[PDB]
């Protein structure tokens, strides 16, 4: 490795992406970790860990599963708008065919939402209600089927992903690499997409080498996490298909339905 015009350009690209990341996403990983580790004075989230604590936190706030998925997708509109705004800052993205821009984003947003969801998770549970609540992992897992199976694969991804100890500067480039995936179905001009991702991948590799001296093959390990993200998305699409094809009267507490709407 040498400090040459090429490496300096890749550092400028990483800094540009980081600055747009900060402007586009008001809730960063650093802010989420500060809440989870009990270092935010102004924020002491209420902990929901069983049915008793669920009903005690009531004031702090068609199949049931479909309404949850409709509700959380509606609450995820802001995230989609922010991810879309971030993509405009990726050099070359707006010059692509508009159909390809929509295709890259319509598949990419789900993977990025799960990436950001992992920042809200530790081994014990996940932040909800704009950092004002904390829903434990085992309470979610204990809920009746199919609801008890919704979040557990995402916690399993989150613990492996968070063990990489990426920061917001790492995540900014990683998210850009997700968006510029030239293997999405329906893409018209794959080559200009791959040319941009090649630059983002070079910027990502250099960023990880400089920022994580104690990691081995972190570049490869991070890319393998895209395989986990796509598996999570595919499982949801499959579960919705079988839910659309199975008629099951599913009862769930309205407070739990509201909480699931803050998840994904």
């Amino acid at each position: 490795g040498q400090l040459n015009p090429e490496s300096a350009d890749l550092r400028a690209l990483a800094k540009h992406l980081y600055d747009s990341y900060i402007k586009s996403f008001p809730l960063t990983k650093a802010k989420a970790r500060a809440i989870l580790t009990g270092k935010t004075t102004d924020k002491s989230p209420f902990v929901i860990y069983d049915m008793n604590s669920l009903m005690m936190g009531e004031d702090k706030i068609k199949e049931v599963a479909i309404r949850i998925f409709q509700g959380c997708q509606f609450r995820s509109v802001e995230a989609v708008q922010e991810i879309t705004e971030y993509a405009k800052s990726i050099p070359g993205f707006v010059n692509l065919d508009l159909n390809d821009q929509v295709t890259l984003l319509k598949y990419g947003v789900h993977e990025i939402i799960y990436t950001m969801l992992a920042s809200l998770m530790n081994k014990d549970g996940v932040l909800i209600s704009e950092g004002q609540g904390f829903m434990t992992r085992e309470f979610l897992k204990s809920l009746r089927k199919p609801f008890g199976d919704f979040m557990e694969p995402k916690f399993e991804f989150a613990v492996k992903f968070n063990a990489l100890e990426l920061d917001d500067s790492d995540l900014a480039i990683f998210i850009a690499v997700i968006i510029l995936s030239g293997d999405r179905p329906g893409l018209l001009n794959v080559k200009p997409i791959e040319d941009i991702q090649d630059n983002l991948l070079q910027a990502l590799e250099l960023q990880l080498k400089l920022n994580h001296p104690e990691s081995s093959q972190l570049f490869a390990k991070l890319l393998q996490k895209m395989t986990d993200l796509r598996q999570i998305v595919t499982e949801h699409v499959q579960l919705l298909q079988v839910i659309k094809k199975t008629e099951t009267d599913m009862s769930l507490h309205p407070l739990l339905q509201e909480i699931y709407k803050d998840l994904y």
Binding site: T84, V102, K106
Partner: peptide
């Protein structure tokens, strides 16, 4: 989801 594509299209404007 067409609603999602529409959200993305309006945001891209």
């Amino acid at each position: 989801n067409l609603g999602l594509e529409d959200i993305i299209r309006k945001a891209l404007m």
